[PDB]
Amino acid sequence: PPDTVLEMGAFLHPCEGDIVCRSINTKIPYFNAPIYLENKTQVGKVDEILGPLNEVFFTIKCGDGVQATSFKEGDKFYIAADKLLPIERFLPKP
Amino acid sequence: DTSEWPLLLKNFDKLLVRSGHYTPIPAGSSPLKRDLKSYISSGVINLDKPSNPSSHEVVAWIKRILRCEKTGHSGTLDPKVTGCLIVCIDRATRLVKSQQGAGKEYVCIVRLHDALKDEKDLGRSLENLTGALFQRPPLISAVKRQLRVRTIYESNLIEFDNKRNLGVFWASCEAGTYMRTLCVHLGMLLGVGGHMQELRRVRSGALSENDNMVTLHDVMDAQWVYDNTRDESYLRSIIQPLETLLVGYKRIVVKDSAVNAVCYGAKLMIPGLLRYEEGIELYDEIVLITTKGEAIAVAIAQMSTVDLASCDHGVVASVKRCIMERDLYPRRWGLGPVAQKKKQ
Amino acid sequence: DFVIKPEAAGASTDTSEWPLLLKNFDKLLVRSGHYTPIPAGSSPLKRDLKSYISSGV
Amino acid sequence: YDNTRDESYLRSIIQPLETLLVGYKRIVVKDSAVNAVCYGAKLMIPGLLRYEEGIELYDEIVLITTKGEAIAVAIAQMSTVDLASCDHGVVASVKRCIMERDLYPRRWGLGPVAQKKKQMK
Amino acid sequence: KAPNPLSVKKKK
Amino acid sequence: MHLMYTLGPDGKRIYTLKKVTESGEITKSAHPARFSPDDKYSRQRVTLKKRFGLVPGQ
Amino acid sequence: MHLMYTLGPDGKRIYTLKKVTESGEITKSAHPARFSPDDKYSRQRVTLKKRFGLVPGQ
Amino acid sequence: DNYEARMPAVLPFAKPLASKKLNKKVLKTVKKASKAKNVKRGVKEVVKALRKGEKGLVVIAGDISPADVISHIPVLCEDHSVPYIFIPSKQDLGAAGATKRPTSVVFIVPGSNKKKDGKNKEEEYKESFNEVVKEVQAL
RNA sequence: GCAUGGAAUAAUAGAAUAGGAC
RNA sequence: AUAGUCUCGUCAACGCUCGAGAGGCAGAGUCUCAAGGAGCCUCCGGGGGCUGUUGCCAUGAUAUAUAUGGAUGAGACAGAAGUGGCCCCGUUGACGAGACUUAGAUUAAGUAGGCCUACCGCAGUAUAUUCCUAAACACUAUGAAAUGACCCUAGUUGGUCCAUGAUCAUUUGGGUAAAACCAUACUGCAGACAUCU
After folding, report:
1. Is residue E3 reached through a cis peptide bond, with omega within 30 degrees of 0 on the bond before it?
2. What are residue F4's DSSP bridge partners?
3. Which nucleotides of I are covered by protein (CB under 7 A)?
4. Which of A66, B83, B218, G17 is the most exposed place for a label (fewest CB within 10 A)?
């Protein structure tokens, strides 16, 4: 279990059994990083990172026993703080 | 009438004149008036690549057809992609990545798994993903899958059909962008799911589909014509010079006595300079050409406009890549006036 | 053929269209033309964005 | 620029500082002397390339390079005819230095008279 | 996970 | 296949899904025919295009 | 407001009180819009100006 | 009808073009031969039959994009002394060929069916086929 | 992430047996 | 030593819009103000005009309040709260503090060593080789097509592919898996300020 969690994403679309989330946090998660709820309960792993720089979205691949239709709008998804990367890392070097 | 002059001699009167007088050396030829062996060995084919082969397979087929030394291409092509493909032949293979900064342009058909609630959602998402983007290459691509930032400069939704569930859009993008991940990301943001149905590249680098694009059938037919009838016109029609890949570069015209010296690796000096473009910047990638129009080399400028106009001596440019064959022009160095004064 | 001929028609230099602080450069009297340029610095309009903003108005 | 990474709009809205220096009289400095002038040295005859006509005694001038960028705002120490006439002298004194110090390499002390003085020292 | 013998060689 | 095209007044391509444009133009396929290296019909195509002058060399 | 202007033939401003000039051109407002540093609407303005090519440097 | 629609899409090398009575004769000819199962459909089948050496009439669709799909066929027909005619419609040629999909090229050879019913159908077919190929060679 | 595994040849990080030259 | 440049904190003098508040800007909450009402006339229940240079709200700002403005806004709570959200005049001279230099601006083909060597510039070669086999993609050969083939809790006409070759087999054989650049090792070419009238 993670020691601390941070507000990663907000529920947007349940499409194709995966959770689409607006990235509330300002840093980019690891690929296949575990996504938790605030009681530190693992809901799934990060599957895809997409969207422009101003509005980053990410798609969580749900774990087994979790269904995408069960969530509602405004839900929050949490990640351990070790699984983050700065946005300037992916930007081209000067 | 200089706007009708071909290849890198187009609009040559706009170049600032450093020294208007020289004596011609009867060596070399115009790129369109070369001998056929040197024409094929410096050729570039803008090709309509079909769907089912691979890019490497198509390049290998062209290599087999022309019986040339080597062929090469440059692009992160997905499989089953028709359209613009630049195949460089022999010497021109050193210029496969010369126009990487020009970007590319695709026309893509995206297939949506479910019908949208409203038609303008696809257009809103298409203008949403225009700009910098986070992309990971697909598993089909040979490169490693890492998250990169790639820029889609422009996009336009040409057509969209809900009943057919098919959307045609034109996208202008930076080199290294994948339309497959673009269609996937569109399918996630519409929330219905989607993927890439068809892909065609309508512009690659400097050349587009309008710039003398030929098929593989034309290449085989022209090779057969030259083999059986010894007629070069069709082979010269399908095959473009490498100077087509060097357009958009700032040009410096070199005296004929300095062409071989540059081919031997020397720096270009002020006495070798004849004409130059306006606004040449320091550390800028330029092309050294000659008066006949054939490109000597791709160089890096060591002077700006004021020093190109006013200075009497010094390094004008340094050769980054050499294109011209060595000893094509006769070596004429060591005969200069101040050089003879220094030798004496 | 299309060959740049000796003494052909070409554009001479015109410093009136040159950018800021280089305009009318021929009007300056010439002390010496014999010098060795150093490949350093940049044009004011061709700076990198950090140096362009840091030198901007 | 923050989100799209395009720089053309920032380059459109922002002008170079040399737009403020158009009305000044220009003196062109050799690239070897640029760093010395940035370090506070008085510009002399060997560093001079070009001088604008109409320069008077104790006049506001701008020292510029061949790339058109502004080194400093200076006070002229000889007129135009004195610039043409003499072979040794001081031509300017830096009032305000605009250029960064080590933008150009340090090429002072490399010359016939300079190395002769160094050797005799 | 190692360089090829023809990739790196001792100087003559 | 699905992608079709028509020639514009300028000469550049216009890409569409419909087989027939609303203006009455008949759209053509935007994908080239498949190619096989082991093909023995260069002479026929060269001759037939030569009788009509469609050969790019002529 | 009262200070109005029209763009001249050479590209310079001409000031007047009149809402419509003699030729019939509708005058513009010489005063710029209010600004706040907490303006959170840069994205919408950039998007709408990019739809029509009104961004400087485009 | 279908001619007025398909005429602007014809390729430049599509010679000779049949007129209306010849159009209807060729289409009824293809329909009768496909009922007699003497028809080969598609580019590959016609090319393979021409290399095999059977003799008959060739009917080529006139609106083929890209043209290369039918570019090699008329000269190959001339190499085997085999007459050919162009119809500017491919949908009509496919529909006459007893298939729903369009068919670019149709090759009709007598006596390609081992069935006796097909032989009787070809015997009834032969007069119209001879008249059509005579009108083709008249052009 | 770029065609997998085996056999032979070559090189290598080398270690050893039998020997010279110094 | 002397002198100059950059980044600063204090004093004195001189001018100006005369300079830290019960101040202003930006932002959040609540409330008020927009002829949205009323009465007359009309033209075809609706529409237009008038009373209406009116009414409502704010402002005495060097100020016509019979005035000037009103959402591309104003006022009260608020003389509050907050500022750890921002702003509150310039020039000259002197002093003090941390620094960087003390600069005469070189080079018409290089650098370092013992005539030679190595590095430097450019163009090449190799970055394991041969055989068998596994896998992917596509072609080709053979037999199968319009009552064509495939998919979906499945249809008043569903969707996709399809003679421009779909979907199954059968083995028929060959093809593709590059190119560019960096690094390493080796080979070769020259020491080039460009006459040519």
Report:
1. no
2. F16, F29
3. 1-2, 10-12
4. G17
Annotated catalytic residue, options B48, B78, B121, B211:
B78
Element (DSSP H or E) covering residue C54: helix C49-54
Q: Which of H89, H88, H136 is nearest to H108 (CA)?
A: H136
Contacts of D23 (CB under 8 A, 6+ apart): none
Q: What is the CATH number of the domain that holds G21?
A: 4.10.80.300
For residues B55 and B53, what is the distance between their CA atoms, to the nearest angstrom?
7
Q: Does B332 touch chain C if contact means CB atoms closer than 8 Å?
A: no
Q: Which of residues 126-155 of B touch strand I (CB under 7 A)?
A: 139, 141-145
Could you say which residues 281-340 of protein chain B have a Cβ atom less than 7 A away from any atom in strand I?
none
Write out the residue range of the structural domain in which residue G9 sits.
1-30
- Report the nearest residue to nucleotide J139, CA vs C1': F36
Provide the terminal-to-terminal Cα distance of chain G, rounded to the nearest Å.
32
* Sheet-wide strand order for G4-7: G13-16, G4-7, G28-29
Distance CA D43, CA D92 (A): 5
The experimental technique used to determine this model is cryo-EM
CA gap A22, A20 in Å, rounded: 7
Angle, helices B179-190/B120-128, rounded to nearest 10 degrees: 130
- How far is the alpha carbon of H56 from chain B, nearest alpha carbon, in Å? 28
Q: How far is B340 from chain C (nearest CA, A)?
A: 19
**What is the SS3 string spanning chain B?**
CHHHCCHHHCCHHHCEECCCCCCCCCCCCCHHHCCHHHHHCCEEEEEEECCCCCHHHHHHHHHHHHCCCCEECCCCCCCCCEEEEEEEEHHHHHHCCCCHHHCEEEEEEEEECCCCCCCHHHHHHHHHCCEEEEECCCCCCCCCCCCEEEEEEEEEEEEEECCCCEEEEEEEECCCCCHHHHHHHHHHHHCCCEEEEEEEEEEECCEECCCCCECHHHHHHHHHHHHHCCCCHHHHHHCEEHHHHHCCCEEEEECHHHHHHHHCCCCEECCCEEEECCCCCCCCEEEEEECCCCEEEEEEECCCHHHHHHCCCCEEEEEEEECCCCCCCCCCCCCCHHHHHHHC
Report the alpha-carbon distance of residue G56 to residue H8 in Å, rounded: 46
CB-based contact H56:H109 (threshold 8 Å)? yes
AA letter at G34: R
